[PDB]
Every structure is written in C-alpha cells, then in structure tokens.
C-alpha cells in the first residue's frame, strides 16, 4: 500500500461539551470530542513497507462548526509496546489535554503512536529519529484525512504541528519534512514543539554526568538508554553485542525493554535500571568517556544527525518549555533560535512557563510543561494562525 493508505478505522468513545467543561473544572469547553482509532500503512527506517496505529479527535457541536484545522501531534517517550494513545485516552475517561484543551476547542488532533508502538509491526521503535518520527507522523495525518474525509468532516485545509518531550523532536522533525517537501500537500500555518531535544547531542553531552546547569538528570538511565539502543537498531553502528556498551546485569536486559512489556514509570518506580547517581557503575567504562570526548563516537554521530538545527523554519514556530526543566533544557529553545537565526529564520519565538527561581529546578517541572505549554501555545500562538 502506498505511505499513507488507511487500513482499518473506528470510534472508541465520545465525550460531551459538558462532561469536558466538568473535568477542566476540577475553562469551558466549546466541542463535544469523539476519539477514533486508525491503522495505517507508511514506511520503516529504510523506506520499506510498514504499519503504524494512532488516535484521532473529532471535534463538533453547534459553537463547534468547521472546517476545522488539522493538528498533528507528537506523544512524549513510550516504552510500552502495546501502548495506544486512542486506548489510553479512553481509559483516561478522556482526562488528557489533548481531549480538554485542544479538540474541546475545535481542533482536529491526530497523533500517531510511532513506528513499534501501539498496532505497528516494527520490530522496534526508532526512538528521537527524526526521519521516521516525520514519517509516521505524516503518514498519520494522510490517513486520518481518508476517516475525516468518509466523515465529511470539514477541514480548512490549514495544518498545524504540536508535541511534548520527545513528541517536541518529532514535532519539529515533521515541521521540517513538511517544509522541505511536502508544503504543497500540507498548508502549515504554525507549530508549536513542546520541552523538546532539538539541540539533541548538545543535550546529551551536558547531561552525561547525571546532572547538567539546571538540575539532575533524574531519568536520564531510562531516556539514554532507550535511546542508544534505538539507535542500534536503526543505525547498527554503536556495538556487536550490548555488553560493549551496557555493564552486566543490565547488558542483558536493555535491549528487550526498549520497547517492552515495562512503561518508563514501571521502570522508574521499580528500578528495572539504576539512579542516575549510579551511572559510572551502569555504562562501561570505555564507551562512558568516549562519548564526550569524541565526536566520532558512533552513537554521538547518530545523535548528530538527529539534531535539528541547520535549517530555517518557515512556519511561524513558537518553542514552549521551561526554565526549571532538568530533563530537557529550555537552553534547547535557545541553541535552536539562535541556529535559525543564523541561517536567516525569524520565525520562530519561544516561551517561558518556569518560575524563575532556582529552588523549582527539577527533572520532574518536565511534566508540568505539558498542559502549561499546551495552553500558552494554544492562546499566544494555535488560535492565532486558525
């Protein structure tokens, strides 16, 4: 099937203008929300035939007319397998910021689960590579204009792009396939990457220690190590066998867990992997100082082209993120303009939701920068480019 096609579609469940407007008072919601759920044939790493799933909020009710703009979103890290956002959602009773502050507003969200994710058939999941990241997502976004199109959904043909942590990278990733490529197909009028690694390797770098300028980098043996071993898969440069890389016990275990049968909290809050502060007794001593000290590290090259900062944006982009942000560094925002900048981009802008004071520095003020972010960007920037 050609990257895109719709495999298979249906409607999980629905949630009232009301019943919305009653969890965000826990302001008020203008559209009712129907979750749908999608297949969808698109392409692997090396271009091969592939499947992916993901979720789509249909927004509607009579101060909730179209067309509506197309959102497409980009979840944060995942290392359950079998995790579904449409099936979350819905297990949620609709308690998302997804459902509460964006469809509930009238905007079509689709958001796919990523290669190895959720119904896909990957073997693995390509985890912070863009071209995939980019890939699926469009793919996404393809498919569900097939459901809405069968739905006589009316879209205003305008496209906008949005995700949170590891979702800011593929956000960004796909803001720039689509820039480079596929403008004609998709009409971005704004995107909006949330507390995202686009300076990817420079992140990397000032956090290897465990802790970086802002804070510890709590949950850095969870995130560096899905990430370097989706960087095996996909690059197959990094190492022959796990152990080059990863001290025993844990050698054996890495490999099976991204992704698995263990979500990032059950390994967090079980210690499936070591504390950061035991990180020089987790990764082998060689490939440890390698990493920073040569850049022709292999897995420092895959993150290197992975980056996402030689480029000018286009789209009227607003990075969202905070200051107290340990896991990943609002310096990301930062490096990033001052990238675009360079290379002749005054398109994009970026926000603040910290406090300002030091004493909130935490890996976890990362998670509070999801529905934070979520509304800034929707009030300052989203409604805006409607």
């Known amino acids: 099937p050609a990257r895109g096609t719709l495999l298979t579609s249906n409607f999980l469940t629905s949630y009232t203008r009301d019943a919305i407007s009653a969890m965000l008072a826990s302001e008020q919601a203008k559209c009712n929300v129907r979750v749908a759920e999608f297949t969808y044939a698109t392409i692997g790493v090396e271009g091969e035939p592939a499947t992916a799933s993901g979720v789509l909020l249909i927004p509607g009710g009579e101060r909730c007319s179209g067309p509506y703009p197309l959102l497409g979103w980009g979840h944060p890290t995942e290392a359950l397998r079998a995790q579904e956002q449409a099936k979350e959602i819905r297990d949620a009773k609709g308690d998302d910021p997804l459902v509460t502050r964006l469809a509930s507003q009238g905007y079509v969200v689709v958001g796919s689960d990523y290669l190895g994710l959720g ?71 704004a995107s ?69 049968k263990q979500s990032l909290t059950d390994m967090f809050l079980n210690d499936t992997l070591p504390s950061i502060d035991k990180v020089k007794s987790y990764f082998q001593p060689g490939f440890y100082s390698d990493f920073p000290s040569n850049p022709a590290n292999p897995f420092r090259q895959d993150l290197a082209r992975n980056n996402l900062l030689e480029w000018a944006p286009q789209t009227p982009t607003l990075l969202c993120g905070s200051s107290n942000d340990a896991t990943v560094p609002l310096k990301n925002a930062q490096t990033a303009i001052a990238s675009f900048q360079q290379r002749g981009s005054n398109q994009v802008a970026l926000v603040d939701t910290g406090t300002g004071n030091a004493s909130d520095n935490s890996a976890f003020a990362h998670m509070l920068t999801k529905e934070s972010c979520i509304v800034v960007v929707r009030d300052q920037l989203l409604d805006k480019q409607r």
Not at 238 to 249: K, N
Request: overall charge negative; hydrophobic content about 40%.
């Open 192 to 260: 909006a990457p949330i507390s995202g690694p686009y300076a990817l390797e420079q992140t990397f770098l000032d956090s290897w220690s465990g802790s970086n300028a802002v804070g510890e980098n709590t949950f850095g043996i969870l995130l560096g190590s899905y990430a370097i071993v989706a960087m095996q898969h996909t690059y197959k440069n990094i190492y022959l066998e796990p152990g080059q890389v990863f001290q025993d016990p844990w050698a054996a275990k890495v490999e099976p867990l991204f992704p698995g």
């Open 119 to 189: 119904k896909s058939n990957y073997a693995y999941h390509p985890y912070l590579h863009s071209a995939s990241e980019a890939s699926a997502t469009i793919d996404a976004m393809r498919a569900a204009r097939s459901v809405l199109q069968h739905l006589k959904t009316p879209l205003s043909g305008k496209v906008m792009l949005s995700g949170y942590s590891q979702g800011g990278h593929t956000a960004m990733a796909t803001q720039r396939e689509i820039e480079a490529h596929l403008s004609k197909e998709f009409h971005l009028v």
